[PDB]
């Protein structure tokens, strides 16, 4: 008979949750939402870093979810929760077994959402059935966003990385708490995908976040992911402070100006400069990203790193509008098309060519030339990131690696057939439910392939390995450069992508690296 309503304490006050439960187990779940970590960051503590949470009297209600924080609210269409949007949204909820209390020292795994660091929350991922299952706290973080998590002057006035140092707040939280709801703070695993991926795989080359957690999972998303991480970023602080009327080139008044807008007014910014990029700020980032991996004296914790066979199947060309562009593309205008979106994808106007020739060759035929089109925007954006954090990390801790080739069977119906796993399509497994606004069922072969991305998630959070009996063995990623290819029978692959990392860090490399010498 576990407790319904219960209470447990934080170092701010004590806190009453719900007990729930889940399909395919006997154990009930304890609920703890709407936890803040940080200061509401508003009027001075906006482009601030966050502050200590406040103290209240009596329990706090945790039965309710918390807004998100302010995003552009707007086909593939997802079950939202009912929250509202707000600039007060540095909260967490948290997923215990209900057996855990005080002292119980589980494993925590705490989910950093995607969103392309301007939209997304942490009350879409309910961690109940991963918490029961594989007997785990699952901690959901939220963040700040757009202008309001990545705005810089790049200087003293706001240095930047808001939603990163909001991430680091809700981490140094789990810390000081966790232990109340029995979890082990010396056993948090930090995961999370595509822009979750960025955010963990940031945090494991931060040396604001050492010691903050134990091990990492990046799925679909790494530090490397074009253009999320700048040097600086002049042209889009230019740009805000026209769409802001602040318009002045002193950082001072512009960060002062940016304050005294309403909500609104900052949403009606946000919207017309979709993606802020994080910067090397000095504290979060002391240098890039790409120095960091590259360094001697790097220590990553363990990780699992991977992605999907398809990351640029379907959603991400639907979402960015260029799937109807990409349909257009035949051999006549081949040329042109590279051209136009080597520009798009800041890179020299000489690489067109290469890509050409690596990526298509001597193909005519217009709809294999969209598939090869499609397959160099996956390798670009997320394959060989991947590949590249994996290759720096695994000579200095354990790297597992994966490849998710899964295609859900309930979605052949709704997408086009030649759709294989697409980006988020491994989200469903991890969590043990979609997440789209449908009636769809799992498979039994998908129930399984769902429990063993479970077990593999918390086995490793357990013990910095995903191995256990009655698993496929996943072997760790070394010189033989090998990984799990994840569906309905797993396989061991190896060397993932070999020819195209190769012509990426080779040729194409040289020709990025030539043309910027070239400045003088």
């Not at 001075?44 to 979810?65: I, N, Y």
């Not at 890039?288 to 790193?305: M, N």
């Not at 090869?372 to 670009?380: H, L, N, R």
């Not at 569906?487 to 490399?509: H, I, N």
Request: hydrophobic share 40%.
């Amino acid at each position: 008979s576990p407790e319904a309503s219960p209470i447990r304490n934080t170092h701010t006050g004590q806190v009453r949750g719900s007990l729930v439960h889940v399909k395919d187990t006997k154990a009930g779940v304890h609920t703890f939402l709407g936890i803040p970590f940080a200061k509401p960051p508003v009027g001075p503590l906006r482009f601030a870093p966050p502050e200590a949470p406040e103290p209240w009297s009596g329990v706090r209600d945790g039965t309710a979810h918390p807004a998100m924080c302010l995003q552009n609210l707007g086909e593939i269409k997802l079950k939202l929760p009912p929250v509202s949007t707000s600039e007060d949204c540095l909260y967490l909820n948290i997923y215990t077994p209900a057996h855990a209390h005080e002292g119980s020292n589980l494993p925590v795994m705490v989910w950093i959402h995607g969103g392309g660091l301007v939209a997304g929350m942490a009350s879409m991922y309910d961690g109940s059935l991963l918490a029961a299952i594989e007997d785990l706290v699952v901690v959901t973080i939220q963040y700040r966003l757009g202008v309001l998590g990545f705005f810089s002057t790049g200087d003293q006035h706001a240095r930047g990385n808001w939603g990163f140092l909001d991430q680091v707040a809700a981490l140094r939280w789990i810390q000081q708490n966790i232990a109340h709801f029995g979890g082990k703070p010396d056993r948090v695993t930090i995961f999370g995908e595509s822009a979750g991926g960025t955010s963990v795989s940031s945090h494991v080359v931060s040396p604001m976040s050492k010691g903050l957690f134990h091990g990492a999972i990046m799925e679909s998303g790494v530090a490397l992911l074009p253009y999320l991480i700048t040097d600086t970023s002049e042209m889009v602080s230019t740009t805000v402070a026209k769409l802001s009327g602040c318009e002045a080139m002193d950082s001072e008044a512009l960060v002062r100006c940016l304050r005294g807008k309403s909500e609104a007014e900052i949403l009606a910014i946000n919207k017309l400069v979709q993606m802020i990029p994080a910067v090397v700020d000095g504290e979060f980032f002391p240098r890039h990203p790409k120095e960091l991996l590259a360094s001697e004296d790097f220590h990553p914790v363990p990780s699992i790193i991977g992605v999907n066979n398809d990351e640029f199947g379907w959603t991400i060309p639907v979402v960015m509008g260029s799937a109807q562009t990409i349909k257009e593309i035949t051999r006549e205008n081949l040329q042109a098309v590279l051209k136009n979106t080597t520009a798009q994808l800041m890179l020299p106007p000489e690489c067109s060519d290469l890509l050409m020739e690596e990526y298509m060759g001597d193909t005519e035929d217009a709809q294999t030339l969209q598939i090869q089109f499609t397959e160099m925007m996956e390798d670009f954006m997320f394959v060989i990131p991947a590949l590249q954090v994996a290759y720096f990390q695994r000579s200095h801790a354990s790297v597992y690696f994966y490849e998710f080739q899964h295609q859900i069977a309930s979605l052949k119906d709704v997408r086009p057939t030649h759709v294989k796993a697409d980006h988020a399509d491994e989200i469903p497994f991890v969590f043990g439910y979609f997440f789209w606004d449908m009636k769809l069922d799992f498979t039994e072969g998908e129930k399984l392939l769902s429990r063993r991305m479970m077990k593999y998630w918390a086995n490793f959070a357990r013990h910095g390995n995903p191995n256990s009996e009655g698993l496929p063995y996943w072997p760790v990623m070394d010189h033989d450069e090998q990984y799990l290819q994840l569906d309905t029978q797993p396989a061991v692959g190896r060397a993932l992508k070999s020819r195209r990392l190769q012509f990426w860090t080779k040729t194409l490399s040289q020709k990025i690296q030539e043309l910027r010498a070239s400045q003088d």
